[PDB]
Paper text:
The TGF-β ligands are dimers and initiate signal transduction by forming a signalling complex with two copies of a type I receptor and two copies of a type II receptor; all are single-pass transmembrane proteins containing a small extracellular ligand-binding domain (ECD) and an intracellular kinase domain (ICD). For example, ActRIIA/B bind to and mediate the signalling from both activin ligands and some BMP ligands, whereas BMPRII is the low-affinity type II receptor for over 15 BMP ligands. Of note, BMPRII is particularly highly expressed in lung vascular endothelial cells, where it mediates the signalling from circulating BMP9 and BMP10.
We solved crystal structures of the BMPRII binary complex with BMP10 in two different crystal forms, at 1.48 Å and 2.4 Å, respectively. Of note, the interaction between K81 and V407 is also present in complex AC, but instead of a direct H-bond, the interaction is mediated by two water molecules. Additional water-mediated interactions between BMP10 and BMPRII are present only in complex AC in this region. The third area is between the A-loop and the F3-loop and is different among different complexes. In complex AC, this region makes significant contact with BMP10 (orange oval), with many direct and water-mediated H-bonds. Interestingly, 5 out of 15 residues with alternate conformations in complex AC are at this area, suggesting that the conformation in this region is highly flexible. Many water-mediated H-bonds are clearly visible in complex AC from the 1.48 Å structure.
Numbering used by the authors:
A (entry chain A): 321 to 424
B (entry chain B): 320 to 424
C (entry chain C): 26 to 39, 50 to 140
D (entry chain D): 29 to 41, 50 to 129, 136 to 140
Write the structure that this text describes.
Amino acid sequence: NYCKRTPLYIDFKEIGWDSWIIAPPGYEAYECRGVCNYPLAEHLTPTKHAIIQALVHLKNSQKASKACCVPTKLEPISILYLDKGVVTYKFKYEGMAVSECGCR
Amino acid sequence: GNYCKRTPLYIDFKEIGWDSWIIAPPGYEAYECRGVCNYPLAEHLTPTKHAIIQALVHLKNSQKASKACCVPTKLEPISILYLDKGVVTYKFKYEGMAVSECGCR
Amino acid sequence: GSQNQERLCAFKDPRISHENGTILCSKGSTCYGLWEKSKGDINLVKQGCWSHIGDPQECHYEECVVTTTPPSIQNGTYRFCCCSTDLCNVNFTENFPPPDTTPLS
Amino acid sequence: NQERLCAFKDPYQRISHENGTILCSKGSTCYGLWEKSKGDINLVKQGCWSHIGDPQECHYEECVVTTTPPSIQNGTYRFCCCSTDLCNVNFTETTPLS
């Protein structure tokens, strides 16, 4: 169960946001699931802090928590949304979809 | 509440066995990020658009998505003297070592 | 083409130019249109490229087909579709579900 | 905040090579690193030490080796840091009352 990117489909109608987002209907946002255990693999781009905290947790679980599996790179999607009756197109609406997961 | 925030964490290199290669300092205040990320995610936690959306999905269906995680969002360097293949190596600004800011990701 | 992930789309939204009512959509971007429709009244609002990132479901149609029930906003008049063949976004068709069956109808 | 003048030594590196000094940025302390090996004390490095890291090792006015030397190379290294101009040129390591 190591830290990795797993699927997550967002339906804007289900979350109640197609009051303002009118396209797309939804998208593949993904998420990051799984555990970060020392040693932290290089593909999880660990920070020096994450590696140190992970090692402290292994030595003494009461002194520090595990490093956390989180998005480390996000990507833009296209969107149409309404801002007080004005339609706004954005080809690149940043921060919406996970491309990489890591340990932080 | 126990909301996401920076909390104390002292690193003693002898305790983790890194005194073998780190000459100085003997340890330092690394800090850590602890606590929960609750929707709506507070502005000071600098949430990403993805974190906001994931947090909302988790509230509706905790099986579909995990809570947003409290993690370091800005790290600061320390000065260090260490052995790099037996060579004594100085870095004034060894990056990524100490937490200055925590957020929800 | 298919090898280079480029397609030509209709364009309306007064590196890549958009002369003579078309635009090139690269990196696997689909074509999209947005209309607003009320009975026999139809207005084209916008047309152009839709990023592949997030791989939205209905952009897999070869033709521009509205398959999700329109948003309630603006009296349910919006018609968005996106599609994966050249100039597919010149026109749209509707194929969206009817409201579900409840004990009250 | 103060800009320390510090002793400077690093064969593998503003700096006065003529005076063997470095003018450090605001907040930074002076440091020195020696190695006590085979009955010899040898200078390894000297220069600037960042304030960042909650470093209590560096509040002393004089360069004093306070903590039991690191395990590295059989406890031969001698590190100190200090908060006065040129404090890192030298280091120090029954009670005086009996």
